[PDB]
Amino acid sequence: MFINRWLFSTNHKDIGTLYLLFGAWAGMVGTALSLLIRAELGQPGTLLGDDQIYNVVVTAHAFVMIFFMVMPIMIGGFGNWLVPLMIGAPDMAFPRMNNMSFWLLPPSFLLLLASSMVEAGAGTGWTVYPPLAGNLAHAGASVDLTIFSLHLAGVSSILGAINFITTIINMKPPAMSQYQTPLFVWSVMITAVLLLLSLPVLAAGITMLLTDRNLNTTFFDPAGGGDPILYQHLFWFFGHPEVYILILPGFGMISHIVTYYSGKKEPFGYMGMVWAMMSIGFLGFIVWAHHMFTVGMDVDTRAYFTSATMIIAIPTGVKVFSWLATLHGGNIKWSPAMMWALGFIFLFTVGGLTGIVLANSSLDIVLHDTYYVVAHFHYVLSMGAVFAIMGGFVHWFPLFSGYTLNDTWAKIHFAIMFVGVNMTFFPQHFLGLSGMPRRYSDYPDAYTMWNTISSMGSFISLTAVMLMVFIIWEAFASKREVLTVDLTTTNLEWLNGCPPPYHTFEEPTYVNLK
Amino acid sequence: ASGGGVPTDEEQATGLEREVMLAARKGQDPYNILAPKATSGTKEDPNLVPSITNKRIVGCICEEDNSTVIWFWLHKGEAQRCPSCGTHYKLVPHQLAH
Amino acid sequence: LSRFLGPRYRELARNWIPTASMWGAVGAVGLVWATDWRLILDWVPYINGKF
Amino acid sequence: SHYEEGPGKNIPFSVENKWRLLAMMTLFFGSGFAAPFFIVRHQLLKK
Amino acid sequence: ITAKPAKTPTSPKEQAIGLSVTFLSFLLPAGWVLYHLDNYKKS
Amino acid sequence: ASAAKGDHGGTGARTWRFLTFGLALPSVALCTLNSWLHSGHRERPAFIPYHHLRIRTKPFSWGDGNHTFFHNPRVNPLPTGYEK
Amino acid sequence: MAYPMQLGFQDATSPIMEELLHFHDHTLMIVFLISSLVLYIISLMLTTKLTHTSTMDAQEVETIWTILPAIILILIALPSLRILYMMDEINNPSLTVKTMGHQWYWSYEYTDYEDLSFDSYMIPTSELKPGELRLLEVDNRVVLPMEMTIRMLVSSEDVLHSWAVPSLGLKTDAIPGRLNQTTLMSSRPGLYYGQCSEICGSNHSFMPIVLELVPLKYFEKWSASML
Amino acid sequence: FENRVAEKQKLFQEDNGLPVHLKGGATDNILYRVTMTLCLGGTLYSLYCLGWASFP
Amino acid sequence: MTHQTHAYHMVNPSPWPLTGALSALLMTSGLTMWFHFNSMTLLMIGLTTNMLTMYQWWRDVIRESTFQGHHTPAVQKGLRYGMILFIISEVLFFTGFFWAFYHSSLAPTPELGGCWPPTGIHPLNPLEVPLLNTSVLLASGVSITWAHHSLMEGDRKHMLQALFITITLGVYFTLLQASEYYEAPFTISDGVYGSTFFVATGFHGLHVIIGSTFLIVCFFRQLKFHFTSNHHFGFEAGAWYWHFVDVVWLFLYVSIYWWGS
Amino acid sequence: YQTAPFDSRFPNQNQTRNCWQNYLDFHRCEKAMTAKGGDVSVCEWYRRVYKSLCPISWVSTWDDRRAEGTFPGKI
Ligand code: HEA
Ligand code: HEA
Ligand SMILES: [Cu+2]
Ligand SMILES: [Cu+2]
Ligand SMILES: [Cu+2]
Numbered sequence A: 001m002f003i004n005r006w007l008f009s010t011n012h013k014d015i016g017t018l019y020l021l022f023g024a025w026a027g028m029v030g031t032a033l034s035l036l037i038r039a040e041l042g043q044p045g046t047l048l049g050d051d052q053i054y055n056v057v058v059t060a061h062a063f064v065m066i067f068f069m070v071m072p073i074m075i076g077g078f079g080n081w082l083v084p085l086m087i088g089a090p091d092m093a094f095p096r097m098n099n100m101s102f103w104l105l106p107p108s109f110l111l112l113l114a115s116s117m118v119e120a121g122a123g124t125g126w127t128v129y130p131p132l133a134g135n136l137a138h139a140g141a142s143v144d145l146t147i148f149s150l151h152l153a154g155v156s157s158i159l160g161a162i163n164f165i166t167t168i169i170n171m172k173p174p175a176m177s178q179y180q181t182p183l184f185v186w187s188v189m190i191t192a193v194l195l196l197l198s199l200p201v202l203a204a205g206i207t208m209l210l211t212d213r214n215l216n217t218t219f220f221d222p223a224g225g226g227d228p229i230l231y232q233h234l235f236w237f238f239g240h241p242e243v244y245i246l247i248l249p250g251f252g253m254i255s256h257i258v259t260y261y262s263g264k265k266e267p268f269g270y271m272g273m274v275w276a277m278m279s280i281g282f283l284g285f286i287v288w289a290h291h292m293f294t295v296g297m298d299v300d301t302r303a304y305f306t307s308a309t310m311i312i313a314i315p316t317g318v319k320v321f322s323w324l325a326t327l328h329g330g331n332i333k334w335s336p337a338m339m340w341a342l343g344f345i346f347l348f349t350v351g352g353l354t355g356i357v358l359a360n361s362s363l364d365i366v367l368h369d370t371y372y373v374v375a376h377f378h379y380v381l382s383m384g385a386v387f388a389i390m391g392g393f394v395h396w397f398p399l400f401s402g403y404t405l406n407d408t409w410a411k412i413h414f415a416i417m418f419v420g421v422n423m424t425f426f427p428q429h430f431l432g433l434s435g436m437p438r439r440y441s442d443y444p445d446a447y448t449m450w451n452t453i454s455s456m457g458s459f460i461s462l463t464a465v466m467l468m469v470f471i472i473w474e475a476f477a478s479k480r481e482v483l484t485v486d487l488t489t490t491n492l493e494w495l496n497g498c499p500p501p502y503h504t505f506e507e508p509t510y511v512n513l514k
Numbered sequence B: 001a002s003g004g005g006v007p008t009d010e011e012q013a014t015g016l017e018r019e020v021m022l023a024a025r026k027g028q029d030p031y032n033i034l035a036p037k038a039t040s041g042t043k044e045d046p047n048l049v050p051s052i053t054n055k056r057i058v059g060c061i062c063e064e065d066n067s068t069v070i071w072f073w074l075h076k077g078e079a080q081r082c083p084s085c086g087t088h089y090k091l092v093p094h095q096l097a098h
Numbered sequence C: 001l002s003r004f005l006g007p008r009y010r011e012l013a014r015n016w017i018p019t020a021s022m023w024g025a026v027g028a029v030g031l032v033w034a035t036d037w038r039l040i041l042d043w044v045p046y047i048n049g050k051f
Numbered sequence D: 001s002h003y004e005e006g007p008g009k010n011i012p013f014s015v016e017n018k019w020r021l022l023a024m025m026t027l028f029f030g031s032g033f034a035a036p037f038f039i040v041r042h043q044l045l046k047k
Numbered sequence E: 001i002t003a004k005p006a007k008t009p010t011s012p013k014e015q016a017i018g019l020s021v022t023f024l025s026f027l028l029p030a031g032w033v034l035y036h037l038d039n040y041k042k043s
Numbered sequence F: 001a002s003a004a005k006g007d008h009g010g011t012g013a014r015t016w017r018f019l020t021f022g023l024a025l026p027s028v029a030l031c032t033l034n035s036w037l038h039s040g041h042r043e044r045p046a047f048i049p050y051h052h053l054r055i056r057t058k059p060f061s062w063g064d065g066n067h068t069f070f071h072n073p074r075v076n077p078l079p080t081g082y083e084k
Numbered sequence G: 001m002a003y004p005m006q007l008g009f010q011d012a013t014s015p016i017m018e019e020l021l022h023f024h025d026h027t028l029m030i031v032f033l034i035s036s037l038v039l040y041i042i043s044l045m046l047t048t049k050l051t052h053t054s055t056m057d058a059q060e061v062e063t064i065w066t067i068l069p070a071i072i073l074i075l076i077a078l079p080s081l082r083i084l085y086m087m088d089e090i091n092n093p094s095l096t097v098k099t100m101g102h103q104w105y106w107s108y109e110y111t112d113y114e115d116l117s118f119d120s121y122m123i124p125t126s127e128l129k130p131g132e133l134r135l136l137e138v139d140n141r142v143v144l145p146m147e148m149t150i151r152m153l154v155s156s157e158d159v160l161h162s163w164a165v166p167s168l169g170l171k172t173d174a175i176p177g178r179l180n181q182t183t184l185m186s187s188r189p190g191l192y193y194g195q196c197s198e199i200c201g202s203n204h205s206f207m208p209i210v211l212e213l214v215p216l217k218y219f220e221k222w223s224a225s226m227l
Numbered sequence H: 001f002e003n004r005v006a007e008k009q010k011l012f013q014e015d016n017g018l019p020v021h022l023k024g025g026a027t028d029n030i031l032y033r034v035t036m037t038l039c040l041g042g043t044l045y046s047l048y049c050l051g052w053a054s055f056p
Numbered sequence I: 001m002t003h004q005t006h007a008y009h010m011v012n013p014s015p016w017p018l019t020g021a022l023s024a025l026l027m028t029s030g031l032t033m034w035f036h037f038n039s040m041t042l043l044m045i046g047l048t049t050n051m052l053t054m055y056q057w058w059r060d061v062i063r064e065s066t067f068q069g070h071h072t073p074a075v076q077k078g079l080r081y082g083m084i085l086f087i088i089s090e091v092l093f094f095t096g097f098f099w100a101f102y103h104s105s106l107a108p109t110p111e112l113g114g115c116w117p118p119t120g121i122h123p124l125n126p127l128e129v130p131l132l133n134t135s136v137l138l139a140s141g142v143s144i145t146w147a148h149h150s151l152m153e154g155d156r157k158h159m160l161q162a163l164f165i166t167i168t169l170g171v172y173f174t175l176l177q178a179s180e181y182y183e184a185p186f187t188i189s190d191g192v193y194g195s196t197f198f199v200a201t202g203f204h205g206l207h208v209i210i211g212s213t214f215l216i217v218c219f220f221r222q223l224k225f226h227f228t229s230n231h232h233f234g235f236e237a238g239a240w241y242w243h244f245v246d247v248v249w250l251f252l253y254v255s256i257y258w259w260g261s
Numbered sequence J: 001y002q003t004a005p006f007d008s009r010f011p012n013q014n015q016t017r018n019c020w021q022n023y024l025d026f027h028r029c030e031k032a033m034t035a036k037g038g039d040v041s042v043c044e045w046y047r048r049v050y051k052s053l054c055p056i057s058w059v060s061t062w063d064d065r066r067a068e069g070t071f072p073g074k075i
C-alpha cells in the first residue's frame, strides 16, 4: 500500500511531492554548508583548517544547492505537479520513467555524501577542473564518487527532460495550440530542451576525466598531449545553459504569480514573453567561453564572446519590462507570494546587471576569480531562483496540500530573508572590486570588515529558513481547509479543488475548435 | 519477392487500441482524440458537451488567436455560458464507452 | 529427407526441446558424476573428494 | 484505486497528530541540517 | 483564497512550543559539533 | 568516386531486396577479398621509450596493473620495452 | 594593495588599469541608471488605486524597450572592446620574465642573458616583522624595472594557478604545458601585491605575489647579486 | 510457426486485479522477489563498503 | 470519471524504476570498488539487477502494448517523440568526443612532437579493415530497410530473412572491430591519440552491441507474431537506433580513421 | 640583444609554440652547421630567443629527451 503508492508510483502528483520533499531536505544540507563557509570567513584566521577541508565544503555547497535543491524543486516538484494540471492531461507521457528520474536522485546524493567522507573529500570547486581533480593532486575515490553522482543526476534530468517535452507537445487538448499553453508550461518545455542538449556534453567531459584518472588516458594531461583547457570548454558548454536551466522555470512562476496577484487575466505581451525565453535559451548556448577570459585565448574570439554574451540582455529586458507592464492597471494584492515576486524582479535585475559588467573580457580580467562574481551569482540564485521557489511554494501550497499557511507569519519570513540575503551578498561586491579572491579560507587583514558583516547576514538567513520549517508545521497542525480560490477561469490548476484528486482529467476537457 | 504472414490490426488489435479503431471507422470518437467542432453557440444552438458524468470542464478560446483559454465546469442542466463571451454550452450524456 | 520439414515439426521440436535438453543436462552432469570429472569438481563447494 | 484522497492524505507522512508530526519534521529537517557538521567533524578526526 | 477555520487550532502556547523545538533541533547539533571544534583539531 | 546511377522509380520490398543482394552484399564480398588480399602482416614497430606513449599514472584495475586490456605482445610493448 | 573598508578598485599603478577604472565608472553609471529606473517604475505601478485590468496592447511599447537596451549595449561594448585590443597590443618589451606556479609558491626566471631563478614563498604570519602584511608578504620579491615594458610569461609545473596583480590590472592563469603571455608596465616605483587567483589545493590562499619596482640601475645590480 | 498472441492477450486482459508485472504467473513473482532481494542486499553491502572506506 | 475517456495509458505501479535506480547505485559505486579497492562483486551484482530490471520493464511494456492493447495512436505518437529525443541526447554525447578529437588533432602539443599523428604512433590503414567495417555497416542499412518494407507488406518470411542478414552484419562488424583492437599497434595508454581513438570508437562499439541485441529482440518478437503490418514501433525504433549507429561510424571513419591518421 | 622581440607568426596570448619553434630551429641549424662544417658557423639567434621564452624545465627535459633519443620533435 504505502510501498505501492510511494515507492512504486506512476502519479505525477505523488512523484512531484516526492521531489519537493527531496529538495527541501537537500536544502537543509546546503544551508548548513553555506554556514560553515561564512563561519570560516567571519573572523580573520582559520576555523576549520586548510583550503582542502574548506573547499570540500564549498564544493558540496554548490552541488547540493544546484543539483539537489533548485533543480529537483522547480522541475521535478513544480514541473510534475503543475504541468499536467495546466494543460489538462491525465498524467505524463511516461509515468514509470518519471519515477526512475526521481529515484535516481537519492542514490546520486549518497555518492556525493560518500565522496566527502572517504579520504579527504573533493576540494576541487564545483567545476572539478583538472589537474587539481586528477589522480595525482586528488588521488582516491572522492572525485570519482563526485563524478558518478553527477552521472546519475544527469541521467535523471535528461530522462525527465524527455518526459516533459513529450507530454507538453503530445498531450494538450486537440484544439489547443502551443501558443495557448501558459508561460510556466512553456518555461519548462524550453528548460527541458536545454537539459537534453547540455547535459550529455557534461557527461562526455566527466567521463573523459574519469578515464584520465583510472584508465591512463590523457585527454586533459599535457604529458600525453592533452589539454586542461579542453575540459573547460566541455564543462562550460554545459555550465552556462545550466544556469538558464536554473532560472527559466523561475521566470515562468514569476509570470504566473505577478499576473494572479495583479488580478489580471493574462500576462502582458504573452508572445513577447515566449519569444524572450526562446531567445534566452538559444543565445545561452553560444556564450560558454565568457567563463574563460583569463585562460589565454585569442583577442578576437575573446571579443566575440563578450558581445554574444551581451545581447542576452535584450530579451531578458523584454521580460522584466513585461512583468512591470503586467502590474500596471492591476488590482494588487499584497500577499506573501507577491512580495517574493517583486523582490525577484528587482534583485534579479541587479544581479543580472552586475553580470553584464563581467561580460566584458577587459574588465573581467581584474574581476574574474574574485568575490564580485560570487556576488553576481548569489543575487541571481539566492534572490532570483530562490525567491521564485518561495513565491511559487507559498502561492501553490494550498493546491498541493489543501491547507492554508498563516499569511502574517509568511510575511515575517519574507522580511527576515530579504534583510539576510542583502546583508550577506551586498558587501561582497566591494571585497571583489578590492581584490579578495574566491575559494580562500582566509584573507589579508583589510577584507575583515565586509567579511564580518557578510557572515552576520548569513545568520539572519539561517533564522529565516528555521522559521519557514515551523511555518509549514503550523499550517499542517492547524488544518484550515481551502474553500474558495479566485480567478480560476484563467488558472486551470485550481479547477479540481485543493488538493486535486489522485486522478484528474479521467474524462478529458472540452475545447472547441473555432 | 512474394508471400505473406503478418497479422493486421483489424485482426490482431485488442484492448482500447481496438476500441478506438472501430469507433473511429463508425465516424464516432469516444476517447476524445479529435477536436470538437463549434456550433453557432446561440441560446438555441448551444455547443453540445458530451460527458460521462454530470459536469465537465469546458475551455473556451473566445477569439481565434487568443492565447488565453477560459476554463469552467459545465454542469448537467440548462445551457451555460462562457464567462467572457456568452457562447452557450450544454451537457449531454456520453454514449459509447467500452 | 525433406519431410522432416514442416509447420508442425517446427512447433513440435519447439515442444520436445525441454524434455530432451533436460536429458542432455542430466546426461552431462551424470556423466561427470560417473567419470568423476576433474575441473568441475574444483567448482563444487561440497563434493571435494580430494583433501 | 484504494488510495485515500483529500487534505492530509496525499502525503507520505501522517498529519493527524500535530506533535507526532512535530517530531517527524524535526528529525527530517534536523538530520539534514546536522549532516554537514558531523562530516566536517569526521574529517577533522582522521589520521 | 478563503478557508474554513482550523479543524485543530494551534494556540499561541502550542506555537511557542513548536517554534522553540524547531529552533533547537537546528541549533543544538550544530552548536555541539562547533563547540568542540578545537578538540577535533587537536585529536 | 561516383555520382549515382540506374533509377527504378518504384521502390517496394522487392527493390530493397534487390539492392541488398545486388549491391550491398556484393560490396561486402569485394572489400572482404580486398582486405583478405592486403593482409600484409606489419613487423612489430621499433621500440623507443617515448614519454608521450605507454602512459601510466595509475596501474590498470586488472592483471599486473601494467597491461592494457586488448594487449597484443607481438605489437604492443610494455613501458620498459616489448614483452618477449 | 587593499586597505581597510575599501569599496572600489585598488589604485591604478599602470595605464591599462587606469583605463579600466574609467570604463568601470562608465559601465557602473549605466547599471545605476537602469537599476534605479526599474525600481522607480515598480514603486510607481504599486502606488495607485486606479485600475485597468482589461486587455492592454503590447508590441507598441515593446519596440521602445527593445531598441533602447540595444543602443545602451553599444555604448558599453565600444569602450570595452577598444580597451580589450589595447591590452593585446603590438608592443616591444625590453625584458622577459617567466613565472611558474607551483603547489604553494611561485618561482621566477629572468633568463634573457644569465640563468637567474629564485623561489617566492609567503612569509608565515608568525615570522613577520612589524609593519609587514599578514598574508601578503613573500620572502623573495620579484624585482623589476619601473617605467619599462616587461613581458611576463605565465605557466605552471603542476595544477592550475593564476598569477594576478590587481594594481597593474593583470591576471593570467598558469596552465601546465602552456606559456601564456602578458605585458607588465608600471608607471611608478613601489611594492605591488597580488594573490593566486585559481583554486590549487590546501594552501591556495597562502601563495601571494609581490612586485617590487625600482629604477633600472638598481634592478641590474639586484639581478647580479642574485647570481 | 505458432501465433498465439491471442492466448496471451486473454491471459493479460483477465480481470484478476493483478498488476502487469505479476499478471503472468508464478515466475513473475519469483523473478520479482529475486530482483528485489539482490537490489536491497546489494544496497546494504554498498553502505557497508562506504562506512568501511570512510576510515583511514 | 471511474472509466477514462482519453486515449492515454495509466501505467500500473511498477517496482522497476526503484530497482533500476538501485542498479545504477550498485554499478557506479561498484566501479568505484573495482577502480580503487580492487573488487568486482559489487559491480557484478549491479550488472545483474540491471539486466533483470531491463528485461522485466521491457517485458511489461510488451505486455501492455501487444497483449493488453494500451498503445492507442496517441500513445504511439508519444513514443516516437521519446525515441527521437533520446537519439538526440546521444548525438550530443558523441559530440563531446569529436570535440575532444578535433581539439587535439588540429592543435598538436609539442609533447607529441608538434604534429599529428604524434610521433611514435602507427595509425591503421583506412583502406584495409576500416573500409570493410564501413561497407558492412552500410549494407545492414539497406537490408534493415528491406526488412521494414517486407513487414509493412506483411511478408513474414522476408522480414525475418532481412532482419537476420542485418543482425549478422552487425555481429560481423563487432568481431572485425574486436580483432582490430587486438591487432592495433597502439593502446588506450598511448597518449591522446590512443585515448581519443579507443573511447570514441569504443563507445560506438558498445552502441553496435546495444543496437544488435535490440534487433535480436525484434527478431524474436516477430517469430512470435507480435508485429502487425501497421503497428510495430519496437521495430521502427530499433531501426532508427541502427541508423544512428551507421552515421556515427561514418563520422568516426572520416574523422579519426582517415583525416586524423 | 635585449629580449626576444615580437613575432608576427606568434601574435597571441599563447606563446607555447614560440618557445617550441625556436628550440627546434636552433638545434636543427646546429646539427646542420656541424654536418657541413661550413666553417662551423653558428645559429645563436635561435638560442637567445628560446632561452628567454622557454621556461628552464622545458629546455632541460627536452635536452634529456634529445640525449636518450626520446625527443618527439624532428631535428
Ligand atoms: C540563474 C543564474 C544566473 C543567471 C541568470 C546569470 C546571468 C548572467 N550571467 Fe552569470 N553566473 C552565474 C549565474 C547566473 N548568471 C554563476 C553560477 C556564475 C559563476 C560560475 C562559476 O564560475 O563558478 C556566473 C558567472 C558569470 C560570468 C563569468 C565571471 C568570471 O569571470 O568568473 C559572466 C561573464 O560573462 C556572467 C555573466 C552573466 C550575464 C551576462 C547574464 C545575463 O543573463 C544577465 C541578464 C539580465 C539583465 C541584463 C538585467 C535585466 C535586463 C534589463 C533590465 C535590460 C536593460 C539592461 C541593459 C541594457 C544592460 N556570469
Ligand atoms: C542554488 C544556488 C545557491 C544558493 C541558493 C546559495 C546560497 C548561499 N551561498 Fe553559495 N554558492 C553556490 C550556489 C548557491 N549558494 C555556488 C554554485 C557556488 C560556487 C562554488 C565554487 O566556488 O566552486 C557558491 C559559492 C559560495 C560562496 C563563495 C565561497 C568561496 O568561493 O570561497 C559563499 C560564501 O559566502 C556562498 C555562500 C552562500 C550563502 C551564504 C548562501 C545563503 O544565501 C543560503 C540561504 C539559504 C537558502 C536560500 C536556502 C533556503 C531555501 C530552501 C532550503 C528551500 C526550501 C524548500 C521548500 C520551500 C520546499 N556560496
Ligand atoms: Cu555563463
Ligand atoms: Cu595557486
Ligand atoms: Cu591557488
Ligand SMILES: [Mg+2]
Binding pocket: A369, G197, G198
Ligand atoms: Mg578561474
Ligand SMILES: [Zn+2]
Binding pocket: B060, B061, B062, B070, B082, B083, B084, B085, B086, B087
Ligand atoms: Zn468564450
